[PDB]
Design an enzyme around this catalytic site. Structure first.
Site: not given
Ligand SMILES: Cc1c(O)cccc1C(=O)N[C@@H](CSc1ccccc1)[C@H](O)CN1C[C@H]2CCCC[C@H]2C[C@H]1C(=O)NC(C)(C)C
Lengths: 99, 99
Positions: B25-27
């Site tokens: 997960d790059t994000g």
């Molecule tokens: C897990 C995590 C960290 O440890 C630190 C920072 C951010 C995140 C984080 O939640 N990142 C997410 C994007 S949303 C995001 C929110 C804030 C900053 C950057 C990105 C993930 O890369 C993707 N994320 C991975 C994953 C997380 C657990 C639930 C299922 C997926 C949901 C998916 C997601 O959100 N998908 C969408 C289509 C709704 C965007």
């Protein structure tokens, strides 16, 4: 372009005449942008991330220019804190993970 | 290994003697696993994703084997619906985005 992951993989996008920064996100099935007005008609959608769900507007066949590469796809609009480019658009620009 | 993004980039991990599947997960800044018992002492941590925040336990210097490559780093444990390998661990295995 090879992008290492020591920092967030943020890229510049052009969408609806506007310049934004967006995160290349392999963990996202969809593309999610903060609130913006887009042509034409949309459909309501709930998407789930970590910690819960948000309501978004689904726009199809929307033109996006990601780091100078054009792609057309579904773009979701709603209260995300970060612009997210998901896998649906990344495949269109030939984007891979490598190691 | 080159991984295209037409499907989720799921890989097999080994952590705490257990085998799991996790999403590259790059994000994600951090690595987040569903509930599991881990050696060491931990610290409470809130992390934000889309739609809100979850409470997790922060374990440091935790050994993880990701697609046969060993890495040691901070692993967060809590109610994520998907195991997430974030950038902190991805840099350790020489993982890049390319296009
Ligand atoms: C897990 C995590 C960290 O440890 C630190 C920072 C951010 C995140 C984080 O939640 N990142 C997410 C994007 S949303 C995001 C929110 C804030 C900053 C950057 C990105 C993930 O890369 C993707 N994320 C991975 C994953 C997380 C657990 C639930 C299922 C997926 C949901 C998916 C997601 O959100 N998908 C969408 C289509 C709704 C965007």
């Amino acid at each position: 372009p090879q992008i290492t992951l020591w920092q967030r993989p943020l890229v510049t996008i052009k969408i609806g005449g506007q310049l934004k920064e967006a995160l290349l996100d392999t963990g996202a099935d969809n593309t999610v942008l903060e609130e913006m007005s887009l042509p034409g008609r949309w459909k309501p959608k709930m998407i789930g991330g970590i910690g819960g769900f948000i309501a978004v507007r689904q726009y199809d066949q929307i033109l996006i220019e990601i780091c100078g590469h054009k792609a057309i796809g579904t773009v979701l609009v709603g209260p995300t804190p970060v612009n997210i480019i998901g896998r649906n658009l990344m495949t269109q620009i030939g984007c891979t993970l490598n190691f």
